[PDB]
Amino acid sequence: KHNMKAFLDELKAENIKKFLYNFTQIPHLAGTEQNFQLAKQIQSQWKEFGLDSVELAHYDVLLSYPNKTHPNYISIINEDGNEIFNTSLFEPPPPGYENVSDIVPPFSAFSPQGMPEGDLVYVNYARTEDFFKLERDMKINCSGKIVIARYGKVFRGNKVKNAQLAGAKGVILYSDPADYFAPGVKSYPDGWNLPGGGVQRGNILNLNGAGDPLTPGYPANEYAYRRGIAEAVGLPSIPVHPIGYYDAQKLLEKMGGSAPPDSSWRGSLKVPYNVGPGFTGNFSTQKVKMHIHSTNEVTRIYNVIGTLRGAVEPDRYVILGGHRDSWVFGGIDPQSGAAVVHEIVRSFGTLKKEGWRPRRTILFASWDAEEFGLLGSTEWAEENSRLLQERGVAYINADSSIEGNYTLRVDCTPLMYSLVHNLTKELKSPDEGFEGKSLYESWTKKSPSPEFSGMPRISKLGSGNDFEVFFQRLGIASGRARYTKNWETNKFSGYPLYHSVYETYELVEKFYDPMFKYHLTVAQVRGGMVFELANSIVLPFDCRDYAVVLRKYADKIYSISMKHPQEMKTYSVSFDSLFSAVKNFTEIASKFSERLQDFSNPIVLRMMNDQLMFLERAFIDPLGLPDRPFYRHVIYAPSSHNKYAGESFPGIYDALFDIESKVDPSKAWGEVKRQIYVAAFTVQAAAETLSEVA
Amino acid sequence: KHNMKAFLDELKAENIKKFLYNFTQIPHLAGTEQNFQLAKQIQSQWKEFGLDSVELAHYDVLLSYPNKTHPNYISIINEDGNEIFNTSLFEPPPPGYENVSDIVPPFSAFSPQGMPEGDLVYVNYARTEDFFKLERDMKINCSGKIVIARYGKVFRGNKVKNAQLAGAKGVILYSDPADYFAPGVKSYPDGWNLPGGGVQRGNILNLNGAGDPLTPGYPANEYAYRRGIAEAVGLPSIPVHPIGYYDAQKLLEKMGGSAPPDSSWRGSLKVPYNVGPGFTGNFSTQKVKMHIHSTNEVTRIYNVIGTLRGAVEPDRYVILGGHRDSWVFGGIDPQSGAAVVHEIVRSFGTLKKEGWRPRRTILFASWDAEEFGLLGSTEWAEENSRLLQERGVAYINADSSIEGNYTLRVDCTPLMYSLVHNLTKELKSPDEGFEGKSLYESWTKKSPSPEFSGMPRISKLGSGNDFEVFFQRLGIASGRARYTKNWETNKFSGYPLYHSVYETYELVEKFYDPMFKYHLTVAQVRGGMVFELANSIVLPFDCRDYAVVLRKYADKIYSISMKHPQEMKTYSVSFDSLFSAVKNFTEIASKFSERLQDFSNPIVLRMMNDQLMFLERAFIDPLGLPDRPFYRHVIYAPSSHNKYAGESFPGIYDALFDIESKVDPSKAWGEVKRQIYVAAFTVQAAAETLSEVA
Ligand SMILES: *[C@@H]1O[C@H](CO)[C@@H](O[C@@H]2O[C@H](CO)[C@@H](O[C@@H]3O[C@H](CO)[C@@H](O)[C@H](O[C@H]4O[C@H](CO)[C@@H](O)[C@H](O)[C@@H]4O)[C@@H]3O)[C@H](O)[C@H]2NC(C)=O)[C@H](O)[C@H]1NC(C)=O
Ligand SMILES: *[C@@H]1O[C@H](CO)[C@@H](O[C@@H]2O[C@H](CO)[C@@H](O[C@@H]3O[C@H](CO)[C@@H](O)[C@H](O[C@H]4O[C@H](CO)[C@@H](O)[C@H](O)[C@@H]4O)[C@@H]3O)[C@H](O)[C@H]2NC(C)=O)[C@H](O)[C@H]1NC(C)=O
Ligand SMILES: O=C(N[C@@H](CCCCNC(=O)c1ccc(I)cc1)C(=O)O)N[C@@H](C[C@H]1CO1)C(=O)O
Ligand SMILES: O=C(N[C@@H](CCCCNC(=O)c1ccc(I)cc1)C(=O)O)N[C@@H](C[C@H]1CO1)C(=O)O
Ligand SMILES: *[C@@H]1O[C@H](CO)[C@@H](O[C@@H]2O[C@H](CO)[C@@H](O)[C@H](O)[C@H]2NC(C)=O)[C@H](O)[C@H]1NC(C)=O
Ligand SMILES: *[C@@H]1O[C@H](CO)[C@@H](O[C@@H]2O[C@H](CO)[C@@H](O)[C@H](O)[C@H]2NC(C)=O)[C@H](O)[C@H]1NC(C)=O
Ligand SMILES: *[C@@H]1O[C@H](CO)[C@@H](O[C@@H]2O[C@H](CO)[C@@H](O)[C@H](O)[C@H]2NC(C)=O)[C@H](O)[C@H]1NC(C)=O
Ligand SMILES: *[C@@H]1O[C@H](CO)[C@@H](O[C@@H]2O[C@H](CO)[C@@H](O)[C@H](O)[C@H]2NC(C)=O)[C@H](O)[C@H]1NC(C)=O
Ligand SMILES: *[C@@H]1O[C@H](CO)[C@@H](O[C@@H]2O[C@H](CO)[C@@H](O)[C@H](O)[C@H]2NC(C)=O)[C@H](O)[C@H]1NC(C)=O
Ligand SMILES: *[C@@H]1O[C@H](CO)[C@@H](O[C@@H]2O[C@H](CO)[C@@H](O)[C@H](O)[C@H]2NC(C)=O)[C@H](O)[C@H]1NC(C)=O
Ligand SMILES: *[C@@H]1O[C@H](CO)[C@@H](O)[C@H](O)[C@H]1NC(C)=O
Ligand SMILES: *[C@@H]1O[C@H](CO)[C@@H](O)[C@H](O)[C@H]1NC(C)=O
Ligand SMILES: *[C@@H]1O[C@H](CO)[C@@H](O)[C@H](O)[C@H]1NC(C)=O
Ligand SMILES: *[C@@H]1O[C@H](CO)[C@@H](O)[C@H](O)[C@H]1NC(C)=O
Ligand SMILES: *[C@@H]1O[C@H](CO)[C@@H](O)[C@H](O)[C@H]1NC(C)=O
Ligand SMILES: *[C@@H]1O[C@H](CO)[C@@H](O)[C@H](O)[C@H]1NC(C)=O
Ligand SMILES: [Ca+2]
Ligand SMILES: [Ca+2]
Ligand SMILES: [Cl-]
Ligand SMILES: [Cl-]
Ligand SMILES: [Zn+2]
Ligand SMILES: [Zn+2]
Ligand SMILES: [Zn+2]
Ligand SMILES: [Zn+2]
Fold first, then answer.
1. How far is B680 from B191, CA to CA, in rounded Å?
2. Nearest to B588 by CA among B621, B543, B553, B554
3. Which ligand approaches the C-alpha of residue B334 most closely?
4. A604-641 burial, b if ≥16 CB within 10 A, otherwise e?
5. Which CATH superfamily is domain A541-694 in?
6. Which among A141, A437, A480, B142 could disulfide-bond with A441, CB atoms 3.0 to 4.6 Å apart, if both were Cys?
7. Ligand with the closest atom to the CA of A383
8. What single DSSP character describes residue B51?
9. What is the β-pairing status of strands B636-639 and B477-484?
10. What is the DSSP string of A262-305?
11. For the purposes of burial, counting CB atoms within 10 Å of the CB of A450, is it exposed (0-12), middle (13-18) or buried (19 or more)?
12. In sequence order, which ranges of A166-220 are alpha helices (DSSP H)?
């Protein structure tokens, strides 16, 4: 038989290992020749594997690179202007790669050029609450200062935005061993920790879903008319550079001014973590000077798009996508995911060669320039938005398959919760001690739901990866799954060698997944989801699961507002409409589920599959969220303080945030009521798409 | 058999006559009790006629009414401040109706209150080119003046916008006999001309598709959060009032200053048509003073929505809609159309009672508050936008069925051209001298296509009626058809008694259509279109007709740009991408048509019916046109100078308009190139929806 078990059994750990090795021998930085060569290889192999069509889709987008003959670095200067300490110009390369060419040195992509010199202020993780603490409580003014912030907790672009709004003239990001050095494990190459010379690369854009900064709304094709740089979307206005903890220690050890306000501001280095501004008495006249000379350049990128045409509903698309570009070798990010995608295509192709086709069309994508702001996936979605919004069933992302070896981690729309629970109950756990138990059992034991008991945690989607345009802009049901660590406070910080030259094939093969069994489990989860989505007669979405979460999110946002009872009385702020809509959604979803279970009629089926497919679409508001026109989903958006985190009822959440500090409370509460109306209306409208059609 | 001929034969002129009489005995002004009573009657009758469900959908929207105890009027005052002439407080009521209550006096809906006093300037039709002539050529400054403008040629809201931007402090609109008195015909009640005391009511909003001024984007339901008046959409900033030509003659006869610049500025009254400013020597110290005391008030409105559920595709909707609210008795506008809709519902219901159902669902709508800015249709479309954009096949409008008795007039999307040509070839002409000939033959003879020879004229859709939200915002294929006059220069001015108290049942029965044969022909065209759209196995749209017009529109916009060859060289302005897209659209549409003709498979059928249904949808840009977010169609929009007229490639047209007057030509031409890119991309994207799906 050609069924899901056939598909799953064809997947092999050994093939994933071979592909990972093949994908990680040289750097594949977006916009480079090496990455174009890999694109061509994948295109050729996907054709050999059996896909119906495999094309490259190219775009010309804004990228950012250091200047090869004018290196970025930071100094401490003395009052004579002698640079008495300089940060490193490169990460010491790992063993056996000290002769690889074209390793990009650590830099913050899209930083402007500048040579700002000033006094340092230390701002902890540079989160919104860290800046509130500095400015409001400690009365420290960051205006005209250079801020130094540790990586972790929130997306680095949010740190930079926060530092800009505080009036900083530059930002230095560093990896503290508190966040990137697990106790008791050795530094690379002898273990999986970050060495003192290691540095995390990464972009510092605040695009809010726009894609290429020069062409918001439209694909960056050959005739595109581009914004000038001064009008580009999301570029930072102050220079930014990342460093390792050996270098950070040199900059932090001389810091004076105020003590850290409490222990949550102290990392693990042997320094006081004084917030500053500036250095202690003896060194009071020394300054810090940045030298950033990176350039932004429009550069061609290439997505590989493979199609496996559906036998019955070829005009319904299930998309499996993940990126191919890496900062350096991409041992985990992204090639651990791309190797999984490659073995999934191979397996589907093996069934295709035996005469099988999926019910619906499956599209496979190898995206480019994810690391520079989701540019490849977003431009392709802009180009194909009409096809996607009328035909897109689901998108499953496939970046890093592993960031640890402890248990599964899943983020997806509520419409896929039942699917994930059901699939993981049929898969074998790879974990030690759970031999012969299901993955559902191990995952549920290790990652219990905070609400539900006997169920696993599944989190909300925000941004940070290539599903963003499909879910937040277009309203296509989306999901993602990987193996992760047991390190809860670090869930947005990255694994220690994240975006460093040390993330290599050897890292994975030696320290993460020697038997490629966690990779295989992730291939079964991702590929199993795609199989069911593309093959199930009735789409495997359960609208009742959305009804349950909408009530939870309504309770949560009401509870936030209720911290302000006097204002709710004064301005007549009622959540009654939103609860009414949620109640209606629950009732209508229950009735739809009954019809779906109780309806030979392919029109009724597809009419009801269209109702299922367009349900996520119904949560899109074509006017977008306030000042974020490309985040259009009313139930979820990437958090305004941390793009990696999803926020629920984001329009109301943002209207309430720090509301006690707004100068015109009537106006501020008016905008809360407006967002409650938009949210109640959208919930009711989505519910009504599940009513009988006529 | 239950086929189109059965449907058409059931329609009766006598029933349309009976319904028109029934609908026009009392005023039905939006927001009044009388109009709610008519809504309830229609709802009851549609149920008796056989519809599956008939509901009222209500909204609370901003309307505008004169103050019953503080009348609006205009004076000439002398230097002592004595009002020496006053305009009328009401139109003399027609015979037999001099005792009807609640006839609203002439007023401009949504005018602000004010009592501005000043010198008059006469601005012809107050078109963009009339103000260019005054200001640029004649060097007459309208700042702080009261402008007096004749109705005609363009929507009155555009006149007011133009007068505001010229700095006018008030506007007086009047009906000149040149435009509203056909030579050789008598004034009402003895003929169909406007008497000197007759006055055209009408709103002066510039909503650009927003619907209710207080709730743009969302339905004005019970929990809606409303903008404050100061932030409302589209309200005029200066007082405005309409008058008849007896009154206009008193205001114009004393005008001095400059002679009219040419004969196209002179109407038919016995006055010089001096442009002013102000009065000739003897009366130089007299002024004109307006007194406007109308109030804007949030008021409940009611749409009637009837459903006839489809037998095979109940989740595909064909909509027949027209409004019910009238300024006074609505003898032509709208009840000549509503009586036609009523007989169409009756006929469909007669087939339904015999066991027939259409293939697709048909929705019937009696809209409210059309006269106050399309408010009923727009709020309902905002409420139901998700259902409409995923299920809406087509919208056929049904306002006034007759505005003359000469020949057919049609405006529709190119997707319906073949349908209209084919249907009119099967209908009998009602015209004298064409007994036994087709309506296609008479219409083609009387209204020849300017391009095509042997074909009739069909015009582009703009705004001015309830199809606007469905077509311009949502991208649902739309059409409209009525009987019209032979008076080409008057095609946007209205028939003489338009929006006056004189448009009565007797007007129609005596002077327009005594045998109700033109009404019946229009019922056959509108109802025949709905029948074919709701019943044809393959949707009756021909994508090749869009390809033909896109080439014509591309040629036209290129020709406008080519009036500026030096700038096109300097700024490298190329239309090559747009022509390429049109060429691709033509090729792909040809191939799709071949597959459609050459494809027992209901999946392929519906897959191809979905391709047909979503083709109009593909021309929507979710970012809208510049500063007009609710006009989203890239090929068509209501003209920025005349909302009644459609404009093609409106984004490029507006970027080119008066470009030689812009102070920063680099920026102005940059924006032309941007609009060419958006247009070429959208054409190509629409074409790609017709490619094989996988
Ligand atoms: C959840 O679904 C329910 C349907 O099961 C839906 O209920 C609807 O609620 C609205 C708003 O409450 C009702 O609106 C009323 O409609 C009647 C006519 O049917 C009007 O007369 C009412 O207006 C009067 O009362 C108002 C409130 O006091 C006054 O402000 C107003 O000036 C009038 O005096 C009112 O508009 C509607 O009838 C029901 N529909 C039903 C029961 O079928 C509810 O709205 C849904 N929730 C959401 C968030 O959409
Ligand atoms: C109408 O449909 C046709 C397809 O039948 C479609 O043609 C496409 O045109 C684009 C743009 O001209 C082609 O883009 C080229 O793609 C190749 C790789 O295939 C690139 O190497 C080319 O880039 C080079 O040349 C450029 C121009 O001189 C340089 O600016 C650039 O720096 C490179 O040196 C170029 O991107 C594309 O291949 C075809 N596709 C085909 C033939 O299948 C056309 O775009 C459609 N029209 C519209 C308006 O969409
Ligand atoms: O690196 C990226 N993404 C990593 C981020 C790893 C650190 C934070 N982790 C999460 O956000 C996360 C991981 C897994 C799951 I299931 C859910 C969330 C990833 O998604 O694997 N994306 C790049 C590009 C910019 C768009 O974010 C970056 O963040 O620098
Ligand atoms: O009166 C309205 N519509 C009339 C307008 C009649 C004069 C101008 N005629 C056209 O625009 C027209 C008529 C028929 C056809 I087929 C196409 C265009 C109608 O559509 O019949 N609408 C109202 C409401 C505001 C939204 O325009 C008005 O214009 O005051
Ligand atoms: C990754 O695997 C690919 C595919 O096997 C290798 O590319 C092939 O290399 C052989 C030998 O040079 C050529 O004959 C083929 O034409 C290549 N096939 C392609 C590109 O589809 C590639 O050598 C491997 N890369 C590494 C680093 O091992
Ligand atoms: C840090 O690097 C800077 C820049 O290379 C060094 O300063 C330079 O030293 C050279 C050789 O002595 C001079 O010719 C340049 O003019 C200096 N440039 C600048 C910008 O100062 C500096 O010596 C280095 N500091 C340390 C401690 O290694
Ligand atoms: C997950 O599996 C459960 C258990 O099999 C599925 O729920 C059953 O579905 C069938 C078919 O509709 C019903 O007859 C049973 O009553 C259901 N059992 C329940 C609700 O306990 C569920 O459909 C699956 N979820 C998917 C496929 O998304
Ligand atoms: C328009 O026609 C309607 C429907 O025939 C008339 O309303 C009916 O009037 C009779 C007699 O008063 C009542 O018994 C019915 O209940 C009404 N039916 C409805 C409202 O559905 C109405 O009288 C006519 N109007 C005019 C001006 O002639
Ligand atoms: C035009 O109407 C105005 C307003 O009614 C008339 O002026 C009023 O005349 C009455 C009675 O003589 C006075 O008591 C009011 O104070 C006047 N009001 C104003 C605002 O002036 C005026 O007489 C009328 N003119 C003509 C020619 O009929
Ligand atoms: C309008 O009528 C024409 C003439 O009947 C239709 O065109 C024919 O359609 C049939 C069925 O596809 C073809 O086999 C013929 O070759 C067509 N004749 C032509 C193109 O000259 C046309 O489809 C009708 N338009 C509609 C229904 O929208
Ligand atoms: C990089 O720097 C070198 C000199 O250090 C300079 O000549 C060149 O302009 C720069 N390259 C850029 C800005 O792309
Ligand atoms: C911070 O310092 C800048 C620079 O002098 C000044 O303009 C700003 O007002 C200061 N703000 C606060 C809150 O002290
Ligand atoms: C793999 O799991 C083991 C056993 O718990 C653990 O000691 C090791 O550190 C894990 N590797 C990684 C990278 O987490
Ligand atoms: C209408 O005018 C009368 C007096 O002329 C006044 O008392 C009332 O306030 C007005 N009505 C309004 C503004 O609705
Ligand atoms: C028109 O008159 C006003 C009022 O004095 C003045 O401000 C404006 O500049 C004038 N414009 C022209 C073009 O004469
Ligand atoms: C009806 O048609 C006749 C004959 O051409 C014409 O004289 C008459 O004026 C028409 N009525 C209207 C309202 O146009
Ligand atoms: Ca873009
Ligand atoms: Ca509204
Ligand atoms: Cl992922
Ligand atoms: Cl109409
Ligand atoms: Zn990645
Ligand atoms: Zn990454
Ligand atoms: Zn009308
Ligand atoms: Zn009207």
1. 51
2. B543
3. 23
4. eebbbbbbbbbbbbbbbbbbbbbebbbbbbbbbbbbbb
5. Transferrin receptor-like, dimerisation domain (1.20.930.40)
6. A437
7. 17
8. -
9. unpaired
10. SGGG--SSSS----BSSB-GGGTT-EEEEEB--EEEEEEEEEEE
11. exposed
12. 177-180
Please report the sign of the dihedral spanned by the C-alpha atoms of residue B679, residue B155, residue B561, residue A229. Answer: negative
How far is residue A295 CA from its own chain's centroid? 25
- A84 vs A216: CA distance, rounded Å: 44
3-state DSSP: chain B helix, strand, coil percent, rounded to 5? 40, 20, 40
Best substitution site from A72, A78, A83 to test ligand 6's pocket, by max atoms within 8 Å of Cβ? A83
Interacting residues of B107 by C-beta distance below 8 A, sequence separation 6+: B64, B65, B66, B72, B201, B241, B242, B292, B294
Ligand 10 pocket, CB under 6 A? B 418-419, 422, 540, 542, 597
Q: Write down the domain spans for chain B.
A: 1-66+293-540, 67-292, 541-694
Q: Is A573 helix (H, G, I), strand (E, B) or coil?
A: coil
To the question of whether residue A384 is assigned a binding role by annotation, the answer is no
Write out chain B residues lying below 8 Å of A579, CB-based. Answer: none
Give the span between the Cα atoms of A439 and A64, in whole angstroms: 41
Q: Which amino acid is at A247?
A: D
Structure-token match 């960031």, residue found: A403
Show the tokens assigned to B540.
């009756």
Question: Is A463 one of the annotated binding-site residues?
Answer: yes
CB A243 within 8 Å of CB A88: yes
The whole-angstrom separation of Cα B503 and Cα B189 is 10
User: Token digits for B663?
Assistant: 């102070």
Catalytic choice (A28, A564, A633, A641): A633
- Does B671 contact ligand 4 (Cβ within 6 A)? no
The Cα A171–Cα A180 span in angstroms is 19
Residue B181, burial from CB neighbour count under 10 angstroms (0-12, 13-18, 19+): buried
Q: Which residues are CB-neighbours of B72 under 8 A, at least 6 positions away?
A: B66, B105, B107, B241, B291, B292, B293, B294
Give me the catalytic one of A176, A247, A370, A403.
Answer: A370
What CATH number has the domain spanning B1-66+293-540? 3.40.630.10
Closest by alpha carbon to B548, among B583, B580, B574?
B583
Contacts of B510 (CB under 8 A, 6+ apart): none
Put simply, the answer to whether B307 touches A676 (Cβ < 8 Å) is no
- The tokens for B461 are 């859709």
Our answer on whether the CB atom of B86 is closer than 6 Å to any ligand 9 atom is yes
CATH level 2 (architecture), domain B67-292 = 3-Layer(bba) Sandwich (3.50)
Which residues fall within 8 angstroms of residue A230, CB to CB, at 6 or more apart? Answer: none
Q: Which experiment gave this structure?
A: X-ray
Resolution limit, Å: 1.8
For residue A9, give both structure tokens.
């059994």
Give the HSE-up count for residue B615: Cα atoms under 13 Å, Cβ half-sphere: 29
Place of tokens 């947005």: A492
Positive/negative CA dihedral, B334, B339, B343, B345 = positive
Q: d(Cα B436, Cα A263) in Å, to the nearest integer?
A: 96
Q: Where are the beta strands (DSSP E) in B368-459?
A: 392-397, 407-412
Residue B485 CB less than 6 A away from ligand 16: yes
Residue with tokens 């087709």: B438
Measured CA to CA, the distance from residue B261 to residue B263 in angstroms comes to 7
Beta bridge partners of B57: B303
User: Which residue among A386, A607, A617 sits closest to B315, beta carbon to beta carbon?
Assistant: A607
Q: Is A497 exposed, middle or buried (0-12, 13-18, 19+ CB in 10 A)?
A: buried
